[PDB]
From a paper:
The small-molecule compound erastin induces ferroptosis via inhibiting the cystine-glutamate antiporter system xc–, which consists of two subunits, namely the light chain [name] and the heavy chain [name] (encoded by the [name] and [name] genes, respectively). The complex formed by [name] and [name] has also been suggested as a possible therapeutic target for cancer, as it is overexpressed in a wide variety of cancer types; moreover, inhibiting [name] impairs cystine uptake, causing an accumulation of ROS and suppressing tumor growth. Erastin functions by inhibiting the import of cystine, thereby depleting intracellular glutathione (GSH), which serves as a necessary cofactor for the enzyme glutathione peroxidase 4 (GPX4) in eliminating lipid peroxides.
Author numbering:
A (entry chain A): 164 to 631
B (entry chain B): 45 to 497
The structure:
């Protein structure tokens, strides 16, 4: 190796200094070329859309608890016993809680009944405060029903209309001070001048705070009777019996959902089958998984009744009220006619079966509340086979979802010729599978979307990522 | 003295491994609990290995580095393959991991809640590396006072996460650790992968190079300072994972690519662009600890027979090591434009913990089969035995884990031995070779203007 003094007299020459100035400039030009290329690949990047800053009732399902006595059992039907079930409710990952009318009401006299004073057969104001604080601890919102005559036939006191309208105005200002998160009124087709009162109540509810709710509930199955209630309101969640009339063919239900979404103009809605009934009172026992897949994947808030996760039937059990059946927590819930229950007819017997109905509820209720393209993604159905209903959810660049349902007892193939969807989320060639309603398919096995053969009463939850 | 000792160890041992690691620790374990046990087991394992290097490097008293600890307990080519596998595996893949984190964390104020192209990352990391190397090829005097400021930057980057992670802890008692030891149903064949991700969080002690009479009262100062200023890091590193888990569930953390920005994006205050700046400065502080401690390693290896004398030559004015930069740069760029973090951690960690396990086993072999060569202090016989046993078992089991990324390190350290007899045990096999290689050294010594001084 060369030493010090033999180096400076060779590396001071012309030529040797020009080649190293040339190499130095070449290295620096390669560096600035990499910098400029990184800048041009940053700029030529596709934009990204802005998240809508949703409310809380957009993010999950609501769980209607109409009759509180038959929810735990007789004698244990107080508000204190309800605090032991909120862990089970958070296991369902419901976001809200529509409690029944807990106020005091005797009968058709309006002067005795009052929407301010709690009935003593349910609990105390201190216990209601403890319920609200423990629910705010678990982040479960509590919505209080306020139908006046909830023990009777005509729930809205059909003699007069003025005092029953004024007392609700006192009722909304009272309970919101206590810290409830919404309200529900039912059977408003039996309330005269309804769309005028609902706008005032909606004003007061939005006038306390912005994170408060009002749910109105009819029984009218007519579309034009529904849109007339939504003339002066946008923030109103209206639950009706619009989906419960039929649906034996898939073309009818497809036309129903797309016609509703076309008529309201792609706004936020609430998908339910009733106002106070279960799913089993309107469907046979095989279609419960299909409708629970459909109601969780539609653009809006799903509202379920209590017991709809376990397939709570009242017609498959002895003497009961058909509007308020008993809840089957264990193998010993139903006291009389012993031996009538079974292993699959209860909560804890379905809390261990992987191919159960409650497991499907828990697998859908977290995919609804966690995934981004089912929260506020777009909606586009398309034509498919004669008997199917297929649609796609996609938000911006997130995981695209594809749901294919078979509303018939026939063996059909899919035949998905898209040809009309936007260019962002057109159909891929091959996509995965998250779950199916029936056993006989493995989860995570990608299919190609051509020979999709469906057994009767099957529904799928395929998904695929954003590509081009 | 004592306080400057715990200061220099706390400055070299913390860094930006706490932002890279906890996603790979959770992925190769199950729940929160097994992850937190891994994060506290790796702390005491690093304490044991640091104590072993401190007890081993003051019994040999040579010119530093565990290249000269494998030599003089094994002599020949065991110590040649270390300095081969160093510049061929460990150092390029070490720079090409902190740089990949650095480039990720500065594109975050431009891609807020959206996806980043990978070729946007790689051509920014490949700007930061070269700026580091150009800063190192100029004066060292600026290169140390920059480092000091980046040390205080990495301290504040730890602190502005550890403060709002306990204000969420004693408030409401927000807990999602419930079911702590309930994992994702199995992790046994990818256990050592977590060992590869935890130990990388504590890396740095094996460049400390303890020499005996430089600290005041050195019979007791070194192990005391190491055991204090390692358990301090273990405390500060387990509470930060607690602070990460107190606001993020164990399933948001597997789908996220930067946990320090999703910690800040839900703990706002209208300057949450602070933490992608400070995590970047902590990633830059580890990049700046680059060509140094490779340079003196090249100086020691070039003094006998390995690594030809063009290396460890020094620029005439501005006396800085240039050919170490020249030999390091097109290797780390090749490994950078190749595969991702999960390949590079495995590919470096195989060889790195294999050779540290060999050296700490050689400590025992020198302790028993040569009972002379006195000890200024000793450790119990179980400490380096346990450290070497865990190291070699995890490295051996890591071949049943992903072997197309670690088996290339094994085939490189097994082509170490066909590169030894060709270049050390031989005498000028052609004359077409020496006269060719002389003009190589002459021409690039003339171009770089480097002397051995
Ligand atoms: C996939 C993993 C990621 C990518 C990794 C890519 C790795 C590519 C292989 C790189 C091999 C580099 C080996 C250099 C080792 C030098 C060892 C050494 O000490 O040489 C001493 C020898 C005598 O020097 P002196 O003591 O007389 O001054 O001085 C000399 O020997 C001078 C020659 C120095 C250069 C040695 C070249 C060795 C060639 C190895 C074959 C593979 C590349 C072949 C390329 C052929 C293109 C023409
Ligand atoms: C697909 C395309 C592939 C293109 C090649 C890709 C590989 C790129 C390799 C880059 C090597 C790293 C470059 C670091 C540059 C050193 C930083 C620097 O500017 O040093 C300052 C030094 C002194 O300046 P001054 O006092 O003379 O003004 O100024 C000087 O000392 C000037 C001389 C140093 C110039 C450095 C340029 C590259 C040196 C080449 C040396 C011989 C190459 C041998 C093979 C190495 C590559 C395998
Ligand atoms: C980041 C590690 O290096 C440092 C640590 C503290 C302060 C400064 C540095 N520093 C140093 C200093 C001069 N040093 C040299 C190496 N040093 C050891 O190798 C440990 O020496 C020991 C001394 C006492 C004990 Cl008890 C154990 C080991 C320690 C001191 N040069 C640098 C050069 C280029 C870039 C950065 C640095 C740099 O940051
Ligand atoms: C309540 O809705 C009304 C119209 O639907 C809006 O304006 C209020 O109208 C009532 C009379 O019906 C007045 O007494 C109020 O003073 C009006 N509010 C104003 C002027 O702010 C309005 O959108 C809603 N009111 C509020 C206060 O938000
Ligand atoms: C919704 O509920 C009402 C109550 O049973 C049904 O009947 C109406 O009842 C009111 C007074 O109770 C009468 O004034 C109406 O004339 C009744 N309607 C009819 C068609 O007879 C009503 O039918 C229910 N709606 C549906 C679609 O079932
Ligand atoms: C239902 O959707 C169709 C498109 O699927 C739209 O129909 C349009 O209606 C307006 C007004 O009647 C016409 O001027 C357009 O020519 C129609 N377009 C098509 C393609 O038919 C509309 O969004 C919805 N229709 C109604 C009546 O609300
Ligand atoms: C719980 O499981 C039993 C056993 O499979 C079900 O009983 C069967 O029900 C089907 C249709 O309901 C009948 O065709 C079988 O003949 C029954 N077999 C026996 C052995 O009972 C029972 O119906 C299930 N319960 C529910 C609610 O689905």
């Amino acid at each position: 190796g060369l030493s010090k003094e033999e180096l400076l007299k060779v590396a001071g020459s012309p030529g040797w200094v020009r080649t190293r100035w040339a190499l130095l400039l070449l290295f620096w030009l390669g560096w600035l070329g990499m910098l400029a290329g990184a800048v041009v690949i940053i700029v030529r990047a596709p934009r990204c859309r802005e998240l809508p800053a949703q409310k809380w009732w957009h993010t999950g399902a609501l769980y209607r608890i109409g009759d509180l006595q038959a929810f735990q059992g007789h004698g244990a039907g107080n508000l204190a016993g309800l605090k032991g079930r909120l862990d089970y409710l958070s296991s369902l990952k419901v976001k809200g809680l529509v409690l029944g009318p807990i106020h005091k009401n005797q009968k058709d006299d309006v002067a005795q009944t009052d929407l301010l004073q709690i009935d003593p057969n349910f609990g105390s104001k201190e216990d209601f405060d403890s319920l609200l604080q423990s629910a705010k601890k678990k982040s479960i919102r509590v919505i209080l029903d306020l139908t006046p005559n909830y023990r009777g036939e005509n729930s809205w006191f059909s003699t007069q209309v003025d005092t029953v309208a004024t007392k609700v105005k006192d009722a909304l200002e009272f309970w919101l001070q206590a810290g409830v998160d919404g309200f529900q009124v039912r059977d408003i087709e039996n309330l005269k001048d309804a769309s005028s009162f609902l706008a005032e109540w909606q004003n007061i509810t939005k006038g306390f705070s912005e994170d408060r709710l009002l749910i109105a509930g009819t029984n009218s199955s007519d579309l034009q009777q529904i849109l007339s209630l939504l003339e002066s309101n946008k923030d109103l969640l209206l639950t009706s019996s619009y989906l419960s009339d039929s649906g034996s063919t898939g073309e009818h239900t497809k036309s129903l959902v797309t016609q509703y979404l076309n008529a309201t103009g792609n706004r936020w809605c609430s998908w339910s089958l009733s106002q106070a009934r279960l799913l089993t009172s309107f469907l046979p026992a095989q279609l419960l998984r299909l409708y629970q897949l459909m109601l969780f994947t539609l653009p809006g808030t799903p509202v379920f009744s209590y017991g709809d996760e376990i397939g709570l039937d009242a017609a498959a059990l002895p003497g009961q009220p058909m509007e308020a059946p008993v809840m089957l927590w264990d193998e010993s819930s139903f006291p009389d006619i012993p031996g009538a229950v079974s292993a699959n007819m209860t909560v804890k017997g379905q809390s261990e079966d992987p191919g159960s109905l409650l497991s499907l509820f828990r697998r859908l209720s977290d995919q609804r509340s966690k995934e981004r393209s089912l929260l506020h993604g777009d909606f586009h159905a398309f034509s498919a086979g004669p008997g199917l209903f297929s649609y796609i959810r996609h938000w911006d660049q997130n995981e695209r979802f594809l749901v294919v349902l078979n509303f018939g007892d026939v063996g059909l193939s899919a035949g998905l010729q898209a040809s009309d969807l936007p260019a962002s989320a057109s159909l891929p060639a091959k996509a995965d599978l998250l779950l199916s309603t029936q056993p006989g398919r493995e989860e995570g096995s990608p299919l190609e979307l051509e020979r999709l053969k469906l057994e009767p009463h099957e529904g799928l939850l395929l998904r695929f990522p954003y590509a081009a | 003295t004592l306080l400057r000792g715990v200061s220099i160890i706390i400055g070299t041992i913390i860094g930006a491994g706490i932002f890279i690691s906890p996603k790979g620790v959770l992925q190769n374990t199950g729940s929160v609990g097994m992850s937190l046990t891994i994060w506290t087991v790796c702390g005491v394992l690093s304490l044991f290995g640091a104590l072993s290097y401190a007890e081993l490097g003051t019994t040999i008293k040579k010119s530093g580095g565990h290249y000269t600890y494998i030599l003089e307990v094994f002599g020949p080519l065991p110590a040649f393959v270390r300095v081969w596998v160093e510049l061929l595996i460990i150092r390029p893949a070490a720079t090409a991991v902190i740089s990949l984190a650095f480039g990720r964390y500065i594109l975050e104020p431009f891609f807020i809640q959206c996806e980043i192209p990978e070729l946007a990352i790689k051509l920014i990391t490949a700007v930061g590396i070269t700026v580091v190397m150009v800063l190192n090829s100029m004066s060292v005097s600026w290169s140390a006072r920059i480092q000091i400021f980046l040390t205080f930057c990495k301290l504040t980057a730890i602190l502005i996460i550890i403060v709002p992670g306990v204000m969420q802890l004693i408030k409401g008692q927000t807990q999602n650790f419930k079911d702590a030891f309930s994992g994702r149903d199995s992790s046994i064949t990818r256990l050592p992968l977590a060992f590869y991700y935890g130990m990388y969080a504590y890396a740095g002690w094996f460049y400390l190079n303890f020499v005996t009479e430089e600290v005041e009262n050195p019979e007791k100062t070194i192990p005391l300072a190491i055991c204090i200023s390692m358990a301090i890091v273990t405390i500060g590193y387990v509470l930060t994972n607690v602070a990460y888990f107190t606001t993020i569930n164990a399933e948001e953390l597997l789908l996220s690519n930067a946990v320090a920005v999703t910690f800040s994006e839900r703990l706002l205050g209208n300057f949450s662009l602070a933490v992608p700046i400070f995590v970047a400065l902590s990633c830059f502080g580890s990049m700046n600890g680059g060509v140094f401690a490779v340079s003196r390693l090249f100086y020691v290896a070039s003094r006998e027979g390995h690594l030809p004398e063009i290396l460890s030559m020094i620029h005439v004015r501005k006396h800085t090591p240039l050919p170490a930069v020249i030999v390091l740069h097109p290797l780390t760029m090749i490994m950078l434009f190749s595969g991702d973090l999960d390949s590079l951690l495995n590919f470096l960690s195989f060889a790195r913990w294999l050779f540290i396990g060999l050296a700490v086993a050689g400590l025992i072999y020198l302790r028993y089969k040569c009972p002379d060569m006195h000890r200024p202090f000793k450790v119990p016989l179980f400490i380096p035995a346990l450290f070497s046993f865990t190291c070699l078992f995890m490295v051996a089991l890591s071949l049943y884990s992903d072997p197309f990324s670690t088996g290339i390190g094994f085939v490189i350290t097994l082509t170490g031995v066909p590169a030894y007899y060709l270049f050390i045990i031989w005498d000028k096999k052609p004359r077409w070779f020496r006269i060719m290689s002389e003009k190589i050294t002459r021409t690039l010594q003339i171009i770089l203007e480097v002397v051995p001084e």
